[PDB]
Subunit: 218 residues, 4 copies
């Protein structure tokens, strides 16, 4: 069962372009409002030689405000929970493969993540740390082989203006049989609120809202 208030614990082990790191996060959030706050410490491989932004979207879709007219795959999936696998394909041919396991114990979700980035241009914006933020997005989700699949045309705002684009592919896998939703959208905004200079401590925010098209069928 999910309360209007909930706690989040995150562990991430990763390698990006040969560099190894660990990240731990203590957080809270409001699942039914689609909002969450997360306090992240770089535990190993400080200082990071790449943009913290690439990591943020691997740092739960339980925290999405779902209209009643659209079945909530992620919330239904508990107490057993769900896992997801993501492919982040950037335009400079940098690739990240990410796997998260989402388990519940009491007031606290536990997020267990594996981050693999490689083939990022060394003089490119991720390894040169020129990303300011992710642009807010719209995930498209549908059913493929009894699973939920999300697709997002994503964009990072660069220092000096312009965008660096990433194609976002997630397969969400519930551990119990759940009621499948039809083709819907989720509006996101991912925001780093505070950080230190090495991004050794970061505070992260996420707002997610499930919807149908606002435009009338005919």
């Amino acid at each position: 069962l999910i309360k209007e208030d909930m706690r989040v614990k995150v562990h991430m082990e990763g390698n990006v372009n040969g560099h190894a790191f660990v990240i731990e996060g203590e957080g809270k959030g409001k699942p039914y409002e689609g909002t969450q706050t997360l306090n992240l410490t770089v535990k190993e491989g400080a200082p990071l030689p790449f943009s913290y932004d690439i990591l943020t979207t691997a740092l739960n879709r339980v925290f999405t405000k779902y209209p009643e007219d659209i079945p909530d795959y992620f919330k239904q999936s508990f107490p057993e929970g769900y896992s997801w696998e993501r492919t982040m394909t950037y335009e400079d041919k940098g690739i990240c493969t990410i796997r998260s396991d989402i388990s519940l114990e009491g007031d606290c979700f536990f997020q267990n993540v594996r981050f693999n980035g490689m083939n990022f241009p060394p003089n490119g914006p991720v390894m040169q740390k020129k990303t300011l933020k992710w642009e807010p997005s719209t995930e498209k989700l549908h059913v493929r082989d009894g699973l939920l699949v999300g697709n997002i045309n994503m964009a990072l705002l660069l220092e000096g203006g312009g965008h660096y684009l990433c194609d976002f592919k997630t397969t969400y896998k519930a551990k119990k049989v759940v009621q499948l939703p039809d083709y819907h959208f989720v509006d996101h905004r991912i925001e780093i609120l505070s950080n230190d200079s090495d991004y050794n401590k970061v505070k992260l925010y996420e707002h997610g809202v499930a919807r149908y098209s606002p435009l009338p069928s005919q």
Copy 2:
């Protein structure tokens, strides 16, 4: 100048998996409300042996409702007008390349379209006409090298359920200096209203509304 009521003429010369066609349209629209309808006659290639859906997004973003806080790339471009180039990339590895030129004489927008589609599996949804409709969508639009570029995750709803995915990339090119918008989103719904069973005659409708994130910054 663009009135509240404007007329639309459309010429399409096209080729899908070897088959050559010409489709003529007469239509009308409300540019500032972001809605329009088009009456489509197949002049050559009747009957068509592939889903009409693949042609529909090619059959003018002037018919996009633009809020005052976002500059309108498409309306500013007139009187000289604009052009666009598009790649549609399907999951079965069918592919379309499209080029459109948008002129304005008096109240009428003329659209000249060259449509190419190939490597569509012959037992694939498109050549078997097993596509019911396009899902509603959300195009993300950024400025790259002074031009406006859109990316859309798109899905066709098939018989038996299931969706058939496509990656939309558009490059829009004003034939004039115009004020350039910040990163923004256009929500879309395209639908076929009426058709004979050969789709030789089709009535097409589109609704398009531009916006920033509905979710607020923190």
Copy 3:
């Protein structure tokens, strides 16, 4: 019937990055040795404002040396002949879509080609005529849905050294049911032998040989 010696006529209508063109071609070759020569005249849109190398591979696998034990898809297809569709995807996101209809009247093959290119960066290798030649190549051919399909990792050698890569995908389609080959390979070399400085007049040569792996199976 295909003789040791045959003639080749070539009509290509095209458009690259907005620039239209027409290229006529009379030529000859030895089908059973997989060698041929072609004399190429630019007839419209001279001089071409882009590298001629993109076009050359679109200017007939009938000129392939086929060992006894691999069926010859192309040669079998005649008299009725065959057609092909090709995708050229360049690493800088230039994209060419090409169709060729291959017919036989007497001892002369007619090749009717439609060539479409778009999204070549204006400062890019293709639009800045900075390519020397195609590296020789190995095509891989497999049967998919009762058609023959080819994939080639191709490279254009650049002025100043280094390579500009391009993923090659051809779908060949005989107009007759022919005996389908097993998975096999075609070794390629294509060469511009002679040209004037605007490439308005080009002499083109290709050598193609089909084989299995030379490596013994354990």
Copy 4:
């Protein structure tokens, strides 16, 4: 220094579709003939719930027959050794991300491999163990930014005929400055010689020979 006979030790940590595994290889090979064998034992995660064939090509290019006219990038890298990064991108949108380190102690090459596979369809041929073998291949190698890069059009033969395509991209990184080869080819054949039906015990063979085009220039 490499001798006509050398030994191989392999430690692969891996996760495919969430299922983790460890494999230990002991094997031998003949570096200047391009031939090698391996004895593979699944030490964790037996039985593997996916096709073994996807793991086989990550289980040295030191064991490649290199002519004198083509510099040997991999044999020059020792005594210090080389690392490699690979992308395997399947047509069903399955993806593997691999990384290897090659060390030499005495007469034995130590290969340390990390394997990540994900978004493999659950009814797909990988997850349904329906892959008979890798077809023989021809890799194409060029220098990009003072590193050697490999591209292969790879196919798995499918039980019930037909093929399952993969795009291989490998970036090899010598840990010492070496002589850089010109654009060349390496012909490959990988073959599982013997296996228990669960594949917990597997014997592996690979042949690899470097060449130029066998077709004369003009």
